[model samples]
Target chain A: ADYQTIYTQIQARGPHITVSGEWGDNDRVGKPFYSYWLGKIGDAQIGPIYLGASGIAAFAFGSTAILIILFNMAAEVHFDPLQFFRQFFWLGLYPPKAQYGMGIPPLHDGGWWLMAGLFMTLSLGSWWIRVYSRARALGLGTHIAWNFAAAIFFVLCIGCIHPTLVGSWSEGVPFGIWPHIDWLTAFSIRYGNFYYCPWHGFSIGFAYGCGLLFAAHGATILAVARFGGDREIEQITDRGTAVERAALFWRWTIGFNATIESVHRWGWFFSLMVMVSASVGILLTGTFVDNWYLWCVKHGAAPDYPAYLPATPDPASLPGAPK
Target chain B: CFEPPPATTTQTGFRGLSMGEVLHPATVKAKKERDAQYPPALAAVKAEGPPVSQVYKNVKVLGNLTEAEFLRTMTAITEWVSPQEGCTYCHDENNLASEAKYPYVVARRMLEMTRAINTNWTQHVAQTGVTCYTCHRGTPLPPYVRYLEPTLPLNNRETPTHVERVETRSGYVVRLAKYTAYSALNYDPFTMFLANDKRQVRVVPQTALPLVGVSRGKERRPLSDAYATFALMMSISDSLGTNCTFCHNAQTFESWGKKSTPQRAIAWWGIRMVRDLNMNYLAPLNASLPASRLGRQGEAPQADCRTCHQGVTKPLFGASRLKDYPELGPIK
Candidate 1:
């Protein structure tokens, strides 16, 4: 292609690769823009990365600290970089033995686990606060921050509340992919079958429902993209012909369709329910209900199988058998 | 069928490791009911008069007991083993010194075994050592003893009739067929591992992948060994009405230093304890027992985990039956 064709193609992709946005301005609702340590790295034109609110700098620092801790643990275990895949499972950074109880163990024991947990809590807490402050700075509703709280609650249930109830930090999830999976398997079997938990069922249902609703809404929006259905999405109060067309497509197919505004609402609701239900499920386990299988039997959700079946006569017990 | 709810639970390890026991109330009730059927322990007697060895012609095992205490122990053993047959079950009424009866000779050997267990196997039994009532439970033969399993025909191998039927302490039967089909677990871990002390039950491979060019003797075990070990594990679990979590953390089934409970060490000693009883104690009695008392292959009716556990975690609900009768503790 000619220079003109290339220039036009590059222009069509975007006006420029350089990012452009608000910087330290007091324009939105007279709320002044703020910067943290992260803003010191670059200027307004090139850098000074503003990740929503000011607290995101702490999140980045905290999250990075956790990664280093993981690597440090890997080094402590003598993890081999040359045999990454082969010795992957051996690389788990495990919690302390149950004998430690809730006490702070030595550095080599489970102190690494505790440190990782602390960093994670601080990072996540910062992120949640950042989300709220970011919404406030943008003059938007705090719904997103509230939704994030649900997920944080779920994390706290597994890493904090449940372990406290059980009287040991060893009950918390380990900091590794395979170890966490093994924990789930052992945890599920330990507390009877997790499948029998009603809250578990609710959590799974809503989690799957969130995906289904999201896909339905996303696909429908893209399906009517030729009619500009995705346009004006940012301006929810402003209705366009694309909305009517998308609604007609669904109404024609399934005799009903949610408005563009209501579709996102549905997704938020489902996503929120997923976290809430899972948190409730973990909180109830080994605390309120001991065995979910037995709980199911008590509630008549599952069949009650008798412990012992009638025994057939033993040949040893027969009178004709040798004494 | 699984036991219903309203059961008792005791945590043995860290929370969520699943190292615990879920005791069905119904099962415990049945065990208590069965324990009630045993006769009350005999009253204590003064250590007065000449020793039983000085008085009786043939006092082989209880020779140290005083004359009155010796008579009391005999009465207790009669009720514990053969109340219906009385002392005649193991002795000749006219000639108490006669060794003609097989029961009399076999009972002496068992008495020796009981003393050895109470004295040397305290790691497994602790202060609440086992007595005759621990296994016999008032019957001449403990119903929970195992023998060499008979070879099954090809057609019967996967059938429900070929399952391992273990009777709990409360007389409730637990079949292993519910856990698998098509003979998933080794059918005779009792003969392969429990009876022999040399056989290792830690068959699970430590490495995730098999190493190439390993030394022949140091090579990884065959997958069949794992299946056999799992079968033995199921036996141990069903024997005590507990799952693997009762002792080892399921995450690290092989590591004792992991989230394993104190009970894991107790169980390690227990496996060796059973092997001692099977090899040194019970197998020798096979020569004296009649054909009916032995397996079809003439193998001795040996003790495995179930022989003493009998489904509950502790036999006789961990009652110190031996404490009441110190004569059975250790011979001087």
Candidate 2:
């Protein structure tokens, strides 16, 4: 109604968007302000960009923190905060010899990982501790809290479950993208048909379930013009109509779509299950069985033959041999 | 005979020293025992003189061997192939060199297949090369064979129990119902592919071979039978245990598009191969054998998926019998 009149309107549709209090530093953003640090520091503008910059900072800072402890354990170089800010980049761990297969950092050592885990744990826990405070209404929103919980579960899987099977924490993490994939391939092939690994199967199922759910959510939101625009949503949409269209998409190929309330719950359930299953599957690596397919065979769950691994080669059968 | 590798470099993906080695205990034992018996067997065959050397002209494959080696290789062929029928399979026995036998022609063409494997397809088999016993495994066919029928099996035999049991090399068993015509067995096999089951062709298509008029298509004129033939080829290739690029070029079914030289030739002979096996060995026995032995309709048990190929492309792991039975190795 105000389209040509006031140009904008405001009302109490629901609770205000809340996020972590530390989500932004008014002091830092206010200092250099809009002149722009080229985002060298957090700015008034925030979103994925602000989130990305700080996330990387936490990894580096956390790594450096671990480095100081290990170095001091031997030759106490002294943790001077300002000095640390300067030296942190170069002073951190490097355990692998140059010739070693993608030698990684010693910071992944069991103790260091614990320190990093504990740090992340406390940081996430500190945010939740504010849930009941007025700060909750001002900071962490309902959606952001859910996001925080997913990240927390992911950390728990890596921190507790992975190392239990990996044995040595030094081999626990990969520093590069392709290298990390290589680690996964090696880890998966350590035994046999990883495809048959039941948890792996479940992880894939849940991941796909979540992805399809995301597509539905995306389509619904976009159709309703509910987000990602400067102007108010143009489409006059109601939950019933928006949901009916979503059900059309779901029912067209699949059989059914859940009620509007159930869809969000499914999103949360699937996301959390996949992350949990990642841990459950990895922990099964060395703890329960080396090969999931073979384990199934042992329990009479699957047949033993038709195995992918070939028998040991017979040297005499080498292509060309003497008469 | 393969070539030596030059000094390894990253250009070829840095390969380490030629320290590679392989051995099989059973092969070693079998080889030693065969070697131990070779000399005496070699002498005894010599004293009897040899089978007709005139057969050498008929012997397109092993003809180059010395008479003694020829005879020895013949024994090797017998071991790998028709050990049950022996010299009679390819020879008249009386003339020994007669071209009258179908086995001689088929076996000759098969040597060309062996030569092709040992030479052209080095990447898959490498220098290891292959020989007959590789796929034949003491039978005429390989073990991992698979196939399906153009139409339902018919009860053509009296006491023709409907449930004819079949097995595959992968150890999958399925029973053929009443009038069961198909054979289910392991990888090695020979099939009467002409029944043309694999083809999914809708109309006659141009020939896809390398040679002239090979575009031989029935073209939209509805000779519906051609589709079944090409369809049979699909089953044949699968039964033949080849999983890579289909025998025909991918561009089009009847176009010579991507067919490697052998994909064109091997399949042709395979088509031609089934023709001879079915005509010569099986059909003649249909009437001569008892009803119990033959189908109830008195039709011969035609060779098909369960024939010469069990389930292997080059059966027996394509292991060269040249080492174990050199007589059967490729001839000069």
Candidate 3:
């Protein structure tokens, strides 16, 4: 087709552009191998990937919960200087330099970490909910079962090697405080590592594993949306025996697959919203404030220069001497 | 005639020091301190190699004042002369006696002459030498000597007439006659020679030496006190067509302390910076160039007095040697 005519057609679409060709070989037909492989990959890999991704996401969520807990503690502790001093003094005995004595100012790293953890958890949690809802609605029974089984396996692994699990240990705590006890030692005890740190290991391990699962789930949704389509299946009506019923059951399976494909398409919209909202929130609230503060501090009369300070002075005062 | 104190003596007037004078001392002190502070740096630079030289061969030394003499003279004249009655006294101010017959006839003509000389000197010679001395020589009648090589009787020097002195000078005799003839033809002889002599020297075609003096007479102001004010006025006119009052509003002329008008203050600062750059920076840069191989005749050396003071008639006999004064310091 001539470019002018194609352009006219595109313009006629008017803000709802689509890459569709009615005359030529359809994209799916031309790339049959690619489509087949992608379908197979989506079917086979989708479950493991979702499980892994959801596991990591769960850990992030738990980590955020811990951060909130710590933030509340700090707010409470900082209110009373005497109690704070007392706590710091005791803590200082173990690591003298690490803890500021008595009236010394408290370190603010915990606050920053708390904020980071909370934001990450919120972002990932939103994604998990959307994915889970889509999976259940689609009747992906095998994938759903696999996710549950993986979560249990992750829990078990975290229980055996508690500290090795991701996001298990709190940041800024001393190495001694971290659960570095050997697996042998842990196993030998009346209670295994899981009994001592039941929630910590499982949350961290699950979150770490969920990251991969999330990526696969996202890819599968995209694949299904792109390739899956619906058309009436061939009718197989018969008043017969168990063999006839079995044939009907197989036909229903194909119908169920078609319905599942629609669910994937709708799920894509949810996934996109989650990703976009999370990215925007991080950029606006976190990155924007950080950069603005940096700029102010660098240029303004401040203790430390901020990132967002302008290089040139205000134009109004160009002819005048510097203030 | 009341021969005023040596032009050099009254050169600084009430203005404690001209910028050059003020800066000369300041620069000297700075140089000393700088050398003391960065002796090693100076030594290292010196040791590395000599500074690249750039001398101009046909660098016309227009009227014989060396760099140092020019600076000293500038400092002296600027300091001694009151600003209002200084060169700007006649050059800028209104001299018309009546609206119908404007003073441009005589005063305007002289101003035109002074300005022409100033332009030429600034362009060809030194930048500072185009002041009142270019034409007046601190005297009124163009340093005239009327007659040529006279076999005078005894006691000639004691009883020398202005005309006889002109003859003795030989070269300037013709110029003096031409000027006198021009004055006699244009204005009445009595008004030109006698009545106007005092006014001529101090008023009429106001001489540079006493322009500021006449202005001071009206107000009973000392020359010294008025120097800075006069310098500012002249500089303002030179840079901008406006006078000092243009920036310094009429009401606040006395309140020199406030820099409320920052634009004007900056403008003044800009002029001073440019002057310093020309004198201290560029002049030194020019001195370093290699002397030209094909030298041009009738051209002066690279430095001279008239380079700056263009119009005022200088002392014909002693002009060349004026740079040799000890107080003037070394010529660069």
Candidate 4:
């Protein structure tokens, strides 16, 4: 049979491929197909529906929630629905005016933001639950689910917790792309540049480290894949030639190489801290630390300049001499 | 959310520094429309006529101007500041040059203030200078004036009491004034920083680890001073309807002369200019102003960044009404 046919047959069974060094006749995809609504809570059928393995419901639900929020916000602002879609990245929900501090605003005055936040929380939380439930149902650990949780934590930091701590719904980031960036630019200036925050600096370092480590591990594994290094479980258990070659490649270049398990641990730790540190950094701004730039000066992180603003030249000396 | 896209961004620095302004087209349009509402400039009068000091009694600041030139400027100021009230707003109708009316006294002092700004502080105002219309905007009182907020009542709440009804896409919303710049740092920055020269904005320390053991006692400026300074900076940003990048690079706001645009120096001068106006010119007017004209704190209205800017980088888009009305200029 062709490779596609062979791959399909192997995928249909569970842990019976030649790569596993074992053979089993367990039927993984033999469950009867059905399209009835609520027929399967995990992976229901609307024809070809898959939840955990191949996501149809999650994608549909997430997309639908986002669309509802977008359309509602467009309507709230009396913007043309068609125009909103064309300028999708430029226009969307605005939070309540700062006067509505920590209060539920009127429908036209950022009630839609409340709706957007709620829908997003539900959609993202449901996705996380789906990931956790599916992993556990398959007897897998919850590492991926927890990894995703870090991202949600950062999102919540921007949307919910930060605004809450600032005591104003206006502090929440807007929904559109340019508006989101505009909020950050204005926000950073308001608090004297957030980059000076040590936690944010730490986050940047960890994020870069995560990217570097990921690239290194990916390149190393792909190089040794010809020796069955891609079969992580087998390579770990067997200490095969692939492992030695991978170890030697890194040892020759860097004098040390993390084992496959340790590399995965390092990657996971770096990835998790990327958002975790940033979330903490974001929380402190405008709350405990009024001005991050000045805070940096108080610490030894940044050099100090003069306190008094520079004196300007006399009018007669200025260009074109006004008088 | 900010105004929608199709924004006009201008690069002010070498690329990759994110140093530029993204202006909202809609806001620019609105500002232009408001600027268009200024009173039209009157025809200039001949300088050959006798000087105002020779022609009329009680002439003070405009004594150098010819009688016809002085009258034309008075007419323009009337149109610019009190179009509804006419010349009677400041004059005793019987004696056109009489200083009996407090308005007449205040107008004379204002003319001196205008000339002072145009001559001495051109570092900030440049050749554009300023006319009464720059602040008055065809009203008896400039809409964007600040006052000396009292310290005793709300020492706890330093921000001024300012609420504005803004028309947003959601209709009229009552909110705190945008001049606060979205942070509760120091609400009364105008009263603290603009009116007082003694309380200079000096937040940046002169040394790394400024408050370390060797200099802990020497560095007595509290962290609150930095908060207050940033608060004033925020007001300056909002007043100009621009962001921080318009003046200093955000990456190096402390490093003046380097990385900072020339506008940063202009802003430094602008602060000093406002302080000069507030302390020297406006504060003395408290005696002439009626109880009705004073703030709740019993202080006269003072000019802050917004009094002139009125939500633009330059008053009247830097059109330089000063050239047309040279009667307001310094004595040659």
Which candidate gets the maximum TM-score versus the true structure? 4
Model 2 Cα lDDT, one tens digit per residue, B228-332: 233344456545444323343221223232222234444444454444434554455444544644443555455553333433454333334344444433333
Best prediction by lDDT: 4
TM-score of 4: 0.57
* TM-score of model number 1: 0.50
Report lDDT (Cα) of residue A60, candidate 4.
60
lDDT of 1 by residue, A100-152 (tens): 55577566666777778877887888888777776665567999999999999
lDDT (tens digit, per residue) of candidate 3 on A1-323? 23321122222112322233222212212211223343433321122122334455666676765555444433433434444443321211001112221112224423343344345446445555545644564444445443443433332233212212111212111111111222222121211112223233344444444454456444433333322211112111322233233334435755533233433444443433333332232222111221222223345622312212122232224575322
Residue runs of model 1 more than 4 Å from their true location after superposition: A1-323, B1-4, B150-183, B206-218
Report every candidate's CA lDDT: 0.66, 0.43, 0.29, 0.69
- Report the C-alpha lDDT of model 2 over A286-312, residue by residue, as the tens digit: 445545555665567753222122222
Name the lDDT value of residue B184 in candidate 4: 30
Error of 4 at A270 (Å): 3.0
Clashing pairs in 1: A42-A48, B169-B310
Cα error of candidate 1 at position B162, Å: 11
Provide per-model DockQ scores: 0.01, 0.01, 0.00, 0.06
TM, every model: 0.50, 0.34, 0.15, 0.57
Which CAPRI tier for candidate 4?
incorrect
- What does candidate 4's lDDT look like per residue over B114-203, in tens digits? 888988887788888888888887877776776665221111123433222122332101121134565533235777788868776755
Q: Write the number of the candidate with greater lDDT, choosing between 3 and 4.
A: 4
User: A30-88 in candidate 4: lDDT tens per residue?
Assistant: 44454333432223322322234224445665676687667765764346454445445
The C-alpha stretches of model 3 lying farther than 4 A from their native spots are A1-60, A63-73, A76-111, A114-119, A122-130, A133-318, B1-332
